[PDB]
Amino acid sequence: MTADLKSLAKRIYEAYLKNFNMNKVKARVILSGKSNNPPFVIHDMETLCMAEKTLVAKLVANGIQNKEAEVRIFHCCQCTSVETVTELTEFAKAIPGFANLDLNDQVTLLKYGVYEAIFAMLSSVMNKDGMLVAYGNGFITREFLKSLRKPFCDIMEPKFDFAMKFNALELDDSDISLFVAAIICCGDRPGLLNVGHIEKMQEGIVHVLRLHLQSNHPDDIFLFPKLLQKMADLRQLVTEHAQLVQIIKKTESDAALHPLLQEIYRDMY
Ligand SMILES: CCCCCCCCCCCCCCSCC(=O)O
Numbered sequence: 001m002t003a004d005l006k007s008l009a010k011r012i013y014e015a016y017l018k019n020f021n022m023n024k025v026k027a028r029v030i031l032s033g034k035s036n037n038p039p040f041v042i043h044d045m046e047t048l049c050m051a052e053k054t055l056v057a058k059l060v061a062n063g064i065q066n067k068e069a070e071v072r073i074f075h076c077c078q079c080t081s082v083e084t085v086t087e088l089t090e091f092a093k094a095i096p097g098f099a100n101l102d103l104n105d106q107v108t109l110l111k112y113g114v115y116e117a118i119f120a121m122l123s124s125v126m127n128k129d130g131m132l133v134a135y136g137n138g139f140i141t142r143e144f145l146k147s148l149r150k151p152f153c154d155i156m157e158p159k160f161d162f163a164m165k166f167n168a169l170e171l172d173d174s175d176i177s178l179f180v181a182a183i184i185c186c187g188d189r190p191g192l193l194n195v196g197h198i199e200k201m202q203e204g205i206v207h208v209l210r211l212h213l214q215s216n217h218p219d220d221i222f223l224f225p226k227l228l229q230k231m232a233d234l235r236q237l238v239t240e241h242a243q244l245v246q247i248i249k250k251t252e253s254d255a256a257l258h259p260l261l262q263e264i265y266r267d268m269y
Pocket of ligand 1: 082
């Protein structure tokens with residue numbers, strides 16, 4: 001790894017640590033039970049409702065006008081995505097050539113990349129039993145999410161399935177930061193104006209990723225192609241997620257979609 005490419009990997013990593021509220025080290029410290037403001041455990045309806053009253057009090061301050069639990073949970077899912085979209089938009093500036101792209105191309109890349117990146121990074125807050133939520137202040141169990149009424153019980157399980165395998169690769173955030181940058185730099189997204197420049201930007205970050213994995217994971221000679229496959233798997237996970245969100249939109253009148261997320265989904269797949 002030349003000084004320039006090692007430096008670029010470090011730049012990316014530092015931008016990740018700055019711009020994401022959650023990183024894998026921070027998540028592991030919490031998940032280990034290692035303590036001021038430890039996470040509320042949400043494993044059933046009683047504990048969901050207690051957690052809501054402390055952590056999202058406005059959402060349950062409406063008396064009997066409060067929405068159904070599953071709809072409140074989905075609203076909190078969406079708020080989490082909106083916040084992660086903001087973080088990803090600032091992170092993207094650290095990627096060589098991204099800020100030099102036409103504004104419309106930056107929008108297109110973020111539109112198609114954000115959910116892939118969201119689900120990749122969600123792995124860092126997931127273990128086989130549950131996941132961190134609410135800025136690290138809740139732990140919601142995988143079984144509780146599976147217990148929700150249909151269709152809401154179908155949202156998170158495929159993301160756990162992705163995450164258990166992704167986490168078995170034992171990436172750290174120096175790896176994950178470059179993987180997220182590579183997700184954002186896909187030249188095959190629909191509607192790009194300057195494909196060739198995006199392809200060169202992609203090639204550059206993927207080269208940095210390949211060299212970084214070779215150095216940081218000398219034990220796994222397949223790690224780079226494994227991650228290329230994970231990117232394809234994410235694209236599929238997102239297509240399926242968008243299909244479920246469309247079902248919710250059509251059949252669940254109380255589950256209002258945030259306008260930023262509606263725009264991301266519009267004409268996506
Ligand atoms: C009191 C706390 C309740 C916590 C539930 C929070 C679960 C948020 C994590 C991500 C959800 C997945 C986002 C995809 S689902 C919404 C979307 O499509 O953006």
